[PDB]
């Protein structure tokens, strides 16, 4: 569903987001497509920021750090299950996460 990209920076960020989504192995039992979710999250970030510079990388990094948060597994699970859509997650504030 997310558009493809041929931008190497965007591709790496999609892969990094997919990897963060694998935290704790929850994605397997849930049956989530972690690569597709990663692409949808990245797409929403790129659509809002519209470049791959500092603000873009910061946003990607903050989504990743929260997905990897051992203290907040329900955040990741909500994204994996689709309770939180990827475009919402892309723009969620730290407070909201
Ligand atoms: Na965090
Ligand atoms: Na945990």
Swiss-Prot record:
GO CC, any one term: nucleus
Organism: Homo sapiens (Human)
Record: disease: A chromosomal aberration involving TCEA1 may be a cause of salivary gland pleiomorphic adenomas (PA) [181030]. Pleiomorphic adenomas are the most common benign epithelial tumors of the salivary gland. Translocation t(3;8)(p21;q12) with PLAG1.
Full protein segment contained here: 132 to 228 of 301
Keywords: Acetylation, Chromosomal rearrangement, DNA-binding, Isopeptide bond, Metal-binding, Nucleus, Phosphoprotein, Transcription, Transcription regulation, Ubl conjugation, Zinc, Zinc-finger
Assembly and interaction partners: Interacts with EAF2. Associates with UBR5 and forms a transcription regulatory complex made of CDK9, Pol II, UBR5 and TCEA1/TFIIS. Part of TBP-based Pol II pre-initiation complex (PIC), in which Pol II core assembles with general transcription factors and other specific initiation factors including GTF2E1, GTF2E2, GTF2F1, GTF2F2, TCEA1, ERCC2, ERCC3, GTF2H2, GTF2H3, GTF2H4, GTF2H5, GTF2A1, GTF2A2, GTF2B and TBP; this large multi-subunit PIC complex mediates DNA unwinding and targets Pol II core to the transcription start site where the first phosphodiester bond forms.
Listed GO MF terms: DNA binding; zinc ion binding
Localization per Swiss-Prot or TrEMBL: Nucleus
Domain TFIIS central: from-to ranges: 9-97
Major localization listed first in the record, in broad terms: nucleus
Function: Necessary for efficient RNA polymerase II transcription elongation past template-encoded arresting sites. The arresting sites in DNA have the property of trapping a certain fraction of elongating RNA polymerases that pass through, resulting in locked ternary complexes. Cleavage of the nascent transcript by S-II allows the resumption of elongation from the new 3'-terminus.
A biological process term (GO) from this entry: positive regulation of transcription by RNA polymerase II
Name by which UniProt lists this protein: Transcription elongation factor A protein 1
Membership in a protein family: Belongs to the TFS-II family.
Top-rank lineage group of the source organism: Eukaryota
Miscellaneous comment in the UniProt entry for this protein: S-II binds to RNA-polymerase II in the absence of transcription.
Keyword GTP-binding: no
């Amino acid at each position: 569903r997310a558009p493809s990209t041929s931008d190497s920076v965007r591709l790496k960020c999609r892969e990094m987001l997919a990897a963060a989504l694998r935290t704790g192995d929850d994605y397997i039992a849930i049956g989530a497509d972690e690569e597709e979710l990663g692409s949808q999250i990245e797409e929403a970030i790129y659509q809002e920021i519209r470049n791959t510079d500092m603000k873009y990388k910061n946003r990607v990094r903050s989504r990743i750090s929260n997905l990897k948060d051992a203290k907040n597994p329900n955040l990741r699970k909500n994204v994996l299950c689709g309770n939180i859509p990827p475009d919402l997650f892309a723009r969620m504030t730290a407070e909201e996460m």
